[PDB]
């Protein structure tokens, strides 16, 4: 009978991690330019540039 | 998709649209350039 055999349950490490919930692919062209993602560095905590009123 | 500027282009130039001249308004508002003497320039035509 099947009880006499030694049943082995198959397993696998598909290592298939979750990423996130909401979609964040809306930058630059994706937002026609509404939201802009650059890669610029800056000093301090403030980066201010004056202009004429 | 244009955000990066030149220098001092952020200086506000105008907020009201004034593109209302000649062909823009189908010839309703004529903006010519001609000199004329005196504080008045009158033209007479038959009634």
From TrEMBL, chain B:
This is Major capsid protein. The chain holds residues 8 to 54 of 321 of the full protein.
């Amino acid at each position: 009978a099947l009880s006499d055999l030694q049943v082995f349950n198959d397993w696998a490490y598909k290592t298939m991690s979750e990423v996130l919930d909401q979609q964040v692919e809306l930058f630059n062209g994706a937002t026609r330019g509404a939201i802009i993602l650059r890669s610029a560095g800056n000093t301090g905590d403030l980066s201010e540039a004056a202009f004429w009123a």
